[PDB]
Design a protein around this ligand. Structure first.
Ligand SMILES: Nc1ncnc2c1ncn2[C@@H]1O[C@H](COP(=O)(O)OP(=O)(O)NP(=O)(O)O)[C@@H](O)[C@H]1O
Ligand SMILES: Nc1ncnc2c1ncn2[C@@H]1O[C@H](COP(=O)(O)OP(=O)(O)O)[C@@H](O)[C@H]1O
Ligand SMILES: [Mg+2]
Lengths: 423, 423, 134
């Protein structure tokens, strides 16, 4: 009570001596000294029990409450926190290490929630109020912010904050987690710099984005890479990258910049390879054009269960655009475009596996045929109950892209990895 | 070294005295004289250790700041810099000798780069802002400019200035670069004077404009040709040719003269054959009508990848007009108005090709019939990786345009081309 | 708008529940297809049905809770749909009540066996659904 009552009583002196309406006059620079003196004046005039160190702590608390973000100032500094969800004034949760835990932190009222939300979302020109209910933005620090207003939220306005993860699983980690055999890792390392146009496929939450990020690390630093994402998840260690992001309609169908527009624009920036975040709409067609007109090295991630279904989904996405194409021409384009297809699924035990590393043999008649280089076969469950299985080659000595490895000087490594497959 | 602080002080002094807010006064020559005098006075007063040459260079920097393109001023005016890329505001790259490389040049802040881009795109009366972040322009001097704004780009505004080298290629050069061989290309020379409709189709950077320039130099001087372009690109050497160019909306969003406004007028200038630079939207319709009603021998470069896709694109472009004709009627208009639909596309390696010399025959309802006088197939890759393919005369001694081209007596060379290379 | 919900039910947000007004499971799926097509997205009906299969696992068809049914897959326009609980009518009572019974169809492994095993509830399924047959 005292640790809160002292502040509740002291804040009145600071508010009355210089009202918040005086903002921009004696700003942060002068405001720091103003608060440092006003807190001391209030402590001297009004008896206080907190110590001198406690006096400085309360001065800093006043600074945070007046200028800073107040309640959320400590949380935003902790690196072990990923999400900060509010949903109210006294009921605030956080996420540390996957799980979600409630916290003992309290606002003052709903009006303070609105104040903090507006003062934090204004940093990127957004404005949310009773007339504008919803707000969604990407702050400069590298975080996502979302806010919902009263008229819709019966319980009251809600706030949601995220973070940009900086510890992503490297290829060595995936090797440790036994999701891809070391021979598979060697073959993937060959493919990465081999400039093959891979297309990652897998079910929801099967490890697609992480696998794509791991693959991107094999790019030589002397190439322009332009990434078209919707959530800004990837991070590359190359010295030359042009990160792009779409924009949803901020009003009733105005200002939309669909991923198709970004992919189409990238064709003119002279990229060396286009990397897409998630191919959902008709943009697939444009991406295939990029995969065809001398940008060997592109990558993508769709949502399919098996590579055959990945091909079917690509055809469906192309047809969705309504270009009036004949199906056989689409199949020819896909056959000439996609060189590799990596399948990433998750099993009933919660683990993640790379079921297939497939290549496209071509088109025979009216059917698309494929060859395989690694297949994850299940055999049973161990005593505990975890899934049990292992990979294997299909006796294919020189892949359909061996000449590429010869061209780029990776013939020896690929030959050793594939010959070592017989182990 | 220390020139940065001294230059900042000099710029501040000049702005305080000769402020940029006095625009419309102290014009170019007056601005230069005033800046020189002010910089000399400041060097006399402001403590600067720079020498006389250093003072002159500081004056030049002041001039660039006041009325220049910013630190890019020396970048654009060098000898053999093919491409100039700006990824953000600190990592400007340049391409030399067919390979990229970093440059120590760097800007002052993202805002200055944004202003510089918004000014460079001003030469063509176009605007880039937060409500329209993508800009693609052809500078009058001939270079190509692309700009993306912070709302989409994450690392700051992204800029790409790709200059174009000297004078285009003749048909002889196109035969030298294996683009097409005479035995299957003689139809190009035949149509160079056969005066039949033609529509070049291709993808970005596929060389459509150069193909048109090569295929229009055959037209004999006696004919009156009216060329319509978004910006000066073609350099025909015939004696009787009329050139035009559109005007985008002015400062107040008025005075726009779109391609339709020019083609509809050219319909009443007694032209013998129109040459449209690039077809984008409704103008297509008018051009087709021009080809249908007397003005036989037109040309127009659209944007597509496959001839069927090109025809569907034309259909959609006309549908944008809002007349209410069926697909079959518009396809018949194409058949009787479009004779040859060439295709130009880059292969998986990049080198230019001519994948089609196609002709339109007729209709069988809502489905078009399209003979393919020529096609282009790909065998695989070469020892060094570059693609290997073959054009082949599909074989038609008497094509659809046999009758349409019988007047000039050109069925002779038509039979020669389509029989001397039938196998 | 169901589309968004159906997108939620597939794109990682497991455990979404919707409420519509349709008589039979075929009628429910037909209504879902019509609603999806109503949005102007123009998705071919085949892909809409595939999305419906992906997003729908359990149908509590009240019509009483007359039906509890689940999807099995697709083979074309046909939407393979089996049953878990069926309510049948046998006659009428002197007071006029509709006399019937509610049968656990009999199949032991519904489509959601894997989820139940993951969360540690297959034993409950055996204790309830397998014992219901006997
Ligand atoms: N092989 C793996 N072993 C362990 N954890 C993994 C593995 N692959 C991915 N993860 C975890 O999965 C998360 C990475 O995001 P991911 O699961 O790939 O999202 P996503 O596939 O982009 N989802 P969506 O695009 O919405 O379907 C992290 O928590 C990783 O630790
Ligand atoms: N056969 C060819 N060989 C090499 N370069 C070519 C060939 N044909 C065209 N080009 C190149 O294409 C460019 C022409 O640009 P183009 O793609 O026609 O502009 P647009 O983007 O408007 O289509 C020229 O710079 C030229 O060097
Ligand atoms: Mg052009």
């Amino acid at each position: 009570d005292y640790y809160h009552a002292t502040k509740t009583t002291i804040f009145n002196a600071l508010l009355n001596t210089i009202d918040l309406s005086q903002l921009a006059q004696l700003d942060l620079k002068q405001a720091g000294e103003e608060i440092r003196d006003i807190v001391a004046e209030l402590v001297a005039i009004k008896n206080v029990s907190m110590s001198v160190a406690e006096q400085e702590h309360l001065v800093q608390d006043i600074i945070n409450d007046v200028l800073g973000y107040g309640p959320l100032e400590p949380l935003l500094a902790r690196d072990d926190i990923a999400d900060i969800m509010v949903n109210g004034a006294h009921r605030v949760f956080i996420e540390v290490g996957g799980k979600v835990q409630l916290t003992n932190v309290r606002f003052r009222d709903n009006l303070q929630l609105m104040n903090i939300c507006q003062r934090i979302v204004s940093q990127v020109g957004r404005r949310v109020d009773e007339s504008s209910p919803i707000c969604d933005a990407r702050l400069p620090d590298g975080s996502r912010v979302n806010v919902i207003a009263p008229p819709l939220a019966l319980d009251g306005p809600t706030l949601t904050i995220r973070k940009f993860k900086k510890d992503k699983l490297t290829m060595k980690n995936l090797v440790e987690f036994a999701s891809i055999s070391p021979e598979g890792a060697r073959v993937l390392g060959v493919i990465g710099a081999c400039r093959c146009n891979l297309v990652i496929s897998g079910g929801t939450g099967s490890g697609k984005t992480t696998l794509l990020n791991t693959m991107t690390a094999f790019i030589d630093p002397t190439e322009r890479v332009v990434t078209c994402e919707d959530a800004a998840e990837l991070q590359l260690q190359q010295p030359h990258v042009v990160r792009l992001e779409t924009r949803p309609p901020n009003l009733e169908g105005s200002g939309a910049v669909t991923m198709r527009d970004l992919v189409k624009n990238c064709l003119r920036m002279r990229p060396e390879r286009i990397i897409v975040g998630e191919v959902r709409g008709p943009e697939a067609f444009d991406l295939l054009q990029a995969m065809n007109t001398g940008h060997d090295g592109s990558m993508g991630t769709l949502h399919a269960n098996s590579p055959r279904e990945a091909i079917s989904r690509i055809e469906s996405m192309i047809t969705m655009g309504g270009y009036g194409l004949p199906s056989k021409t689409i199949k020819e384009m896909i056959v000439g475009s996609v060189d590799v297809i990596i399948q990433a699924a998750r099993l009933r035990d919660g683990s993640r596996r790379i079921t297939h590393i497939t290549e496209v043999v071509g088109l025979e008649g009216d059917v698309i045929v494929t060859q395989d280089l690694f297949v994850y076969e299940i055999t049973g469950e161990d005593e505990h109950g975890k899934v049990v299985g292992k990979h294997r080659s299909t006796g294919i000595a020189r892949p359909r892209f061996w000449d590429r490895a010869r061209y780029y000087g990776l013939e020896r490594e690929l030959a050793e990895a594939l010959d070592a497959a017989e182990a």
